[PDB]
């Protein structure tokens with residue numbers, strides 16, 4: 001049928017999608033800026049569609065409830081037909097690939113540790129062997145699922161602690177995890193993706209840092225409902241943008257050119 | 264019912280075992296991709312036969328004839344059912360074959376003989392005393408051929424017309440050329456292979472500078488193959504179980520050939 005505006009689900013996660021200054025008097029896609037806003041424009045141009053950016057209503061990436069089997073977050077928006085495509089830092093995972101399609105990755109990441117500067121922690125093993133410093137993850141995302149499913153001794157030990165810690169060590173948004181690191185005097189460390197960690201390390205007041213190696217290696221992909229006719233063109237567009245150097249330039253633009261912690 | 268796997272002799276992905284002359288079939292070979300093939304086949308429920316690509320190439324399309332060679336060609340022309348190899352995901356290949364999600368990350372990188380006064384691709388481009396080149400019929404050569412980045416296009420203009428040829432038939436021949444050229448040849452190759460060689464005797468090469476791009480290897484199937492979906496889920500399962508990282512640690516294991 002006739003071309004229709006593509007509904008893009010995304011999430012307010014800096015620097016991927018952020019409210020522009022003066023957003024209160026802007027409308028539509030002009031309200032937003034960031035890496036995924038720029039990426040959406042490039043994908044749409046290469047694939048020949050018009051689109052509307054829509055922030056996921058529940059503010060979540062996406063997890064399946066173990067009891068009801070209902071998917072929430074951006075994954076749910078695709079599964080239940082509320083959006084046509086997700087352009088966001090959405091991690092490629094097995095359980096998600098069983099229900100939605102992903103392009104080839106547009107960005108690499110691994111799970112990593114964020115500390116308040118000076119915290120005496122260098123690794124996941126360090127965290128797992130002590131109790132003074134609490135630690136947790138984002139809710140409803142791939143990092144929490146990683147720990148829940150891991151059979152690796154250190155990560156299983158970490159999960160066994162996190163799942164029963166009181167008060168809860170889990171946070172609803174990345175910003176809440178950052179705040180908890182910044183306000184806890186070295187007594188909370190946050191497990192989050194290396195991309196987000198490296199972004200925050202360049203934001204004022206420059207009081208956090210990434211420590212240790214990454215715990216895994218994976219990527220973000222552009223997601224579509226299973227069988228969607230958009231998937232093929234989106235995939236080729238991701239590969240073209242990578243090969244032309246545009247994805248690397250976009251990361252530099254939003255992470256480092258705009259950094260607030262020096263050159 | 265036996266799946267024909269095309270692969271390539273490239274250390275440490277696929278290597279001939281010691282005493283392979285008295286072995287047969289899949290038991291002749293060892294390495295990262297041999298172990299990976301066994302894991303993929305177990306998860307997908309197929310029997311398979313490893314076969315070394317007949318022309319020894321990864322795969323490129325002839326500009327005049329438009330015929331594909333290498334492992335890509337074996338998939339395109341129906342000579343193999345799947346490629347399990349360090350085969351780079353690229354746009355031109357994704358137009359003719361299918362790739363799983365990546366099983367390993369890499370980028371193009373620079374190999375020098377230790378002590379060579381080169382720190383970056385920009386350094387190479389701004390001089391002519393030290394020659395440099397790439398593997399033929401692979402994704403690194405195509406990267407330079409297609410690139411519009413000023414530094415890389417300048418490098419391509421030099422490499423394509425340099426005499427004698429700066430291109431090599433196999434990775435091992437590029438490494439040998441670095442080792443034998445007294446610092447007058449640098450080799451552009453994928454970071455995975457570079458890092459493997461840097462930890463092998465005689466410990467006379469090193470990786471310099473950052474990677475020039477970021478990409479991955481995928482398991483490839485002919486377009487529309489029924490195996491693609493299961494293979495893709497298998498790669499993700501193996502990654503999430505930690506087995507891909509374990510295999511990398513096994514086959515890049517440093518036994519101290521170089522230093523402590």
Ligand SMILES: CN1CNS(=O)(=O)c2ccc(CCc3ccc4c(c3)N(C)CNS4(=O)=O)cc21
Nearest residue numbers: 104105106108218219242364365366368478479
């Ligand atoms: C950025 N980019 C451009 N597109 S691409 O050429 O397809 C490509 C392939 C691989 C990677 C390296 C990072 C990664 C991403 C995703 C996964 C991984 C590993 N592994 C190692 C396991 N499987 S995965 O799909 O979760 C990046 C990449």
Ligand SMILES: N[C@@H](CCC(=O)O)C(=O)O
Nearest residue numbers: 061089090091141142143
């Ligand atoms: N990128 C993750 C969210 C962040 C996290 O879990 O650390 C996801 O897609 O679920």
Ligand SMILES: N[C@@H](CCC(=O)O)C(=O)O
Nearest residue numbers: 321349350351401402403
């Ligand atoms: N992995 C490459 C071969 C090595 C190279 O080109 O440096 C390919 O798939 O073509």
Ligand SMILES: [Cl-]
Nearest residue numbers: 003004005006
């Ligand atoms: Cl419309």
Ligand SMILES: [Cl-]
Nearest residue numbers: 280281282283
């Ligand atoms: Cl032998």
Ligand SMILES: [Cl-]
Nearest residue numbers: 306500501504
């Ligand atoms: Cl298993």
Ligand SMILES: [Cl-]
Nearest residue numbers: 309310311312
């Ligand atoms: Cl078999």
Ligand SMILES: [Cl-]
Nearest residue numbers: 411412413414
């Ligand atoms: Cl440029």
